[PDB]
Write a protein that binds this ligand. Structure first.
Ligand SMILES: Nc1ncnc2c1ncn2[C@@H]1O[C@H](COP(=O)(O)OP(=O)(O)O)[C@@H](O)[C@H]1O
Ligand SMILES: [Mg+2]
Length: 535
């Protein structure tokens, strides 16, 4: 248990009341308190879960992310103004950090705080003991769902390695004089081992902020830190799925025939793949209980819906994206029946799948990758949003995010590729490229067909299939696969003429070649150029 004195050490004073590690029951009662007003206020939906509103911020704010440049982080961090390649690791002075800290601690002073102690990492030897402090009940609920909930025995000897203070209600009015992006802030200090959040209510900032910390600590110890989902079959076969947001990591790893290890952040050490989290954070936009039953059923009491539209009668309108297309729901991992327990970990991965939502409709549904192409595509981290608000006519805008999660990388991309490659090699892991995106029909490939391709990969149907090489990208695509429509395996078939495909394939190839040029500093990246597309 905590005391007002342990908080005073953090710089927080006059603490009225501490709600230490609240149970789901209390949180439920706290969120439904009819006296709550504003963004703290939750509503009860017909499914039994409470729905909240994160306010103005319905997603992350990378432009407000800062890391203090001191003697601990100077020579190790991948700085946005130092290292080649664009990133969000903006340097912050120790003095400006102290100003932001003052703003947050004064904000949490004289309040009734919610303190949640949890773990980030399923293995005791590499895990972080994090202490979350907030004045908003649903934020404590979010960290309870997302992080690893300690047992009574573990809380007994609990010593926080990292502290995260959420001062969402406060903003920095001096930001203009200090040279920051805005009045908001998501700052990190590795000397003090702390995270400060101000102005933004979005819970994703606490989750991804700790992921960014694991992404810094782990690789330096020779452990792969990955933005991937993961599951194991009955035979002990572990599969990992990399990919950016909305590409299918969550919808595809939640397979009723395989034990879910995790859905978003995993490490890979000598023993194998381990989850960092204690829950799942699924996307609910246009959620169908028919296509994704396990995820739909995980939405019940204790799950936390965010930004979804709740009608007057309590029913949820999952199709409504008027506020945001990034509607979410977090829930304890146990809301999914088929999962690995008690500890979310398994053996080494032998199947590495890179998911990509190709808006250009150029990439094939599935391709077996060569060792060089694995490394080339990992560092490229391609995805394409069919943006332009789709009120214009067409706009397949691409995104090249190194390691399929550049937004959370604390070290140079190659450091991630390196530890990952050595792990894949010791395990004899195979890599595959999967397009959960578009083809020539202008429609996204159905979840049904994608799941069939994932099955073909996991059971070796793909590995034994006869394959031919796709021009330019030089991808080995299967001639056919059991359960999947043969017409779609070759992307050129979905076009009226293979000449239509050709045009776009060249455009995408140039984008890839242009993008990869920022890795041709070393003989390694220069060597991998032969693994990329050629016109
Ligand atoms: N063929 C498909 N494969 C995977 N996801 C698909 C597919 N078609 C549509 N989707 C939708 O795309 C989104 C993928 O989201 P999710 O798995 O949550 O992304 P990630 O976990 O990688 O951010 C979901 O909203 C899902 O319903
Ligand atoms: Mg996900």
């Amino acid at each position: 248990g905590l005391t007002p004195q342990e908080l005073e050490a953090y710089g927080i004073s006059d603490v009225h009341d501490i709600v230490y590690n609240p149970s789901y029951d209390l949180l439920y009662q706290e969120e439904l308190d009819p006296s709550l007003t504003g963004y703290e206020r939750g509503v009860l939906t017909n499914l039994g879960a409470v729905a909240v509103d994160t306010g103005i911020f319905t997603g992350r704010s990378p432009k407000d992310k800062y890391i203090v440049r001191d003697d601990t982080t100077r020579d190790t961090f991948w700085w946005a103004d130092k290292g080649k390649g664009k990133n969000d690791n903006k340097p912050l002075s120790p003095e400006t950090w102290q100003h932001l800290k003052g703003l947050v601690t004064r904000q949490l002073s004289g309040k009734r705080l919610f303190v949640v102690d949890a773990f980030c990492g399923a293995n005791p030897d590499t895990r972080l003991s994090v202490r979350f402090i907030t004045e908003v009940a649903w934020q404590a609920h979010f960290v309870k769902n997302m992080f690893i909930r300690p047992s009574d025995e573990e809380l007994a000897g609990f010593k926080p390695d990292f502290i995260v203070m959420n001062g969402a209600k406060c903003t920095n009015p001096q930001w203009k004089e200090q040279g920051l992006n805005s009045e908001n802030f998501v700052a990190f200090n590795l000397t003090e081992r702390m995270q400060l959040i101000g102005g933004t209510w979005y819970g994703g900032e606490m989750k991804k902020g700790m992921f960014s910390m694991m992404n810094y600590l782990l690789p330096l110890k020779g452990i792969a830190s990955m933005h991937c989902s993961a599951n194991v079959g009955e035979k002990g076969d572990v599969a990992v799925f990399f990919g950016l947001s909305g590409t299918g990591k969550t919808t595809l790893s939640t397979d009723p025939k395989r034990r879910l290890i995790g859905d978003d952040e995993h490490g890979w050490d000598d023993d194998g793949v381990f989850n960092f989290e204690g829950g799942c954070y699924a996307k609910t936009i246009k959620l169908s209980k028919e296509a994704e039953p396990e995820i739909y059923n995980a939405i019940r009491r204790d799950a936390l819906l965010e930004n979804v539209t709740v009608r007057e009668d309590g029913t949820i309108d999952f199709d409504d994206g008027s506020k945001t297309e990034n509607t979410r729901v977090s829930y304890p991992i146990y809301h999914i029946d088929n999962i690995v327990k008690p500890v979310s970990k398994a053996g080494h991965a032998t199947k590495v799948i890179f998911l990509t939502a190709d808006a250009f409709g150029v990439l094939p549904p599935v391709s077996r990758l060569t060792a060089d192409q694995t490394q080339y595509h990992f560092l490229s981290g391609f995805t394409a949003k069919l943006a332009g608000t789709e009120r214009g006519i067409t706009e397949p805008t691409p995104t090249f995010s190194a390691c399929f999660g550049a937004a959370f990388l604390s070290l140079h991309p190659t450091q991630y590729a390196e530890v990952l490659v050595k792990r894949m090699q010791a395990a004899g892991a195979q890599a595959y490229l999967v397009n959960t995106g578009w083809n020539g029909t202008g429609k996204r490939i159905s979840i049904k067909d994608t799941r069939a391709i994932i099955d073909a990969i996991l059971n070796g149907s793909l590995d034994n299939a006869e394959t031919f090489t796709l021009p330019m990208f030089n991808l080995a695509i299967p001639t056919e696969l059991p359960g999947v429509d043969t017409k779609i395996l070759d992307p050129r078939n979905t076009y009226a003429s293979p000449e239509q495909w050709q045009e776009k394939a060249e455009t995408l190839a140039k984008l890839f070649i242009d993008n990869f040029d920022k890795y041709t500093d070393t003989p390694a990246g220069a060597a991998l150029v032969a693994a990329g597309p050629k016109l």
